[PDB]
Structure 1
Amino acid sequence: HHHMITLENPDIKYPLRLIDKEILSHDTRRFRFALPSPQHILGLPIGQHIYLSTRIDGNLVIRPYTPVSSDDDKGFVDLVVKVYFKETHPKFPAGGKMSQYLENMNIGDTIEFRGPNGLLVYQGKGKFAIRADKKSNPVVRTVKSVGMIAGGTGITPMLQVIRAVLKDPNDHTVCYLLFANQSEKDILLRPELEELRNEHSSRFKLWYTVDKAPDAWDYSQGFVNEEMIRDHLPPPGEETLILMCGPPPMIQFACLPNLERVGHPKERCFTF
């Protein structure tokens, strides 16, 4: 390890203290935890994520999260989370476990962090180091365009990649994002994504689709489909890699068959 990082060993659990919280909307939040010292950094390679774990209602609960903060930040790590409240959705009366546990924490409480984890690591300048599985070494490839499909919270893994690309004035990679949500109010991190579209149009393309569309809507309506893929993601080729992260039903039924129809082979599709 070159830098003073927090995640020194992936097999270890690190209890971090919650030092701040922001209410972004009725059900979305920003949670900030302190690192071991104000001079530490998290130590999360781009393309990877961490897991939070704790005991809820007598069981061990583990969940993956991709921070919105980065290794440029000293002393803290920020998570942006959607809270799934109980007795709200008729189909899931109990709500979300880790998300509600987070919402119920008091400043000063701690929770365990672990990482980094993930088969994909972006090495910058278009280079992607990928492991077929955990027991293999990574195969490196260089692309010029990265298509990105996100549904719901699957957006944070894309935002981490997007910011890494744009912060490097010498990185010429172009990112294409197709962001899908239930409704306009559910478009997580819209301000941050739009600020980035503002400052780096040449390297960042952005498009949205929502299940229920308001009357004033300039984007798409409906699940991701063939047409959206063709119109908002880069065209198939060795120079193109497609990234995905969202609900299982989205990846299995709306993305793969259509990506296949359009011509993006599975060896160029990665699912976070």
Structure 2
Amino acid sequence: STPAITLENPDIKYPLRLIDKEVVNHDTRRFRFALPSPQHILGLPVGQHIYLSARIDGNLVIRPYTPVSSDDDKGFVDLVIKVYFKDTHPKFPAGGKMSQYLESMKIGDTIEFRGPNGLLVYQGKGKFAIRPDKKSSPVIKTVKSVGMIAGGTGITPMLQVIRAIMKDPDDHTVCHLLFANQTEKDILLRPELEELRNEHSARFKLWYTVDRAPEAWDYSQGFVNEEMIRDHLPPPEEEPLVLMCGPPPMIQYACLPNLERVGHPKERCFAF
């Protein structure tokens, strides 16, 4: 056989039950939901995401989230979601709609999932199928190495790709991750990230930057910049694919101009 698929139709919404919530850090959690049976798999190609939907305060709210589990996982899906709390930030008194709804869910509550979605699919052994837009067919890019620039929760699609590569011992793709967060305590999934480094150092290069660094710091500090991209992503001549995911200003000002500066062409770059 093959396992039963959860996301059988992309227009159907599937209500899934919350079964566990794990702290990632002060504002971020790992939400685990049960699939329709313990034998199901989600049905999500590597690189793709889902959407959650709920009527919040009387209005339908839809938001994408990027699972960090895979179709090898029977019976569950894991999401890693930053909660934007109310009554905290001076510019955002109300906080975030969906993220707080999720934070408020009790174990056994359901939320609607739909998918899969996204223009990139990792097909294994260095092959990426990337559509230029939703209305066009994919084109298949094989590379030997992948640069990854993530900011905050932009780690989630990167972790999906990294995990897929590392579990296949005949996948020789080398991933170079440059991960940016506001402070050291904001780093997400550090432990997990570090264990990948431990076990896969020939295939996985890891570097951090933080907007503000502690006195004890051995990594970079500040927004992603030209130097960091040279030093911590594969060079242009190696013809890598460069993946990027993070806040819109991060992409616009930190990533795009500096990728030009180093010489990574737009055709070998992809923003989630």
TM-score normalized by structure 2? Answer: 0.96
User: 2 CA distance for matches of 1:10 and 1:183?
Assistant: 38
Unpaired runs of 5+ in structure 1?
Answer: none
RMSD: 1.0
Alignment of 1:73-84 (within 5 A): 73-84=73-84
Which structure 1 residue ranges, 4+ long, deviate > 4 Å from structure 2?
Answer: none
**Cα deviations by residue, 1:10-49 (Å, 9 ceiling, x for unpaired):** 1111110111222333322121111111110001100111
Kept in 2: contact 1:179–1:207 (CA 8 A): yes
Range moving further from structure 2, 242-251 or 71-80: 71-80
User: 1 CA distance for matches of 2:143 and 2:22?
Assistant: 37
**Cα deviations by residue, 1:139-159 (Å, 9 ceiling, x for unpaired):** 112000100000000001000
Q: Percent identity?
A: 90
User: 2 CA distance for matches of 1:243 and 1:15?
Assistant: 31
Matched, 1:250 2:250: yes
Cα drift, residue 161 of structure 1: 0.2
User: 1 CA distance for matches of 2:135 and 2:54?
Assistant: 27
TM-score normalized by structure 1? Answer: 0.96
Matched, 1:187 2:187: yes
Unpaired runs of 5+ in structure 2?
Answer: none
User: 1 CA distance for matches of 2:241 and 2:61?
Assistant: 32
User: 2 CA distance for matches of 1:133 and 1:23?
Assistant: 35
Kept in 2: contact 1:184–1:210 (CA 8 A): yes
Cα drift, residue 238 of structure 1: 6.7
- How many residue pairs get aligned? The number is 268
**Cα deviations by residue, 1:146-198 (Å, 9 ceiling, x for unpaired):** 00000000001000100100000000000000000000000000010000000
Cα drift, residue 67 of structure 1: 1.3
User: 1 CA distance for matches of 2:262 and 2:239?
Assistant: 16
**Cα deviations by residue, 1:215-272 (Å, 9 ceiling, x for unpaired):** 1000000000000000000111473100010000000011001101110111111000
Kept in 1: contact 2:24–2:189 (CA 8 A): no
User: 2 CA distance for matches of 1:176 and 1:189?
Assistant: 16
Corresponding residue for residue 53 of structure 2: 53
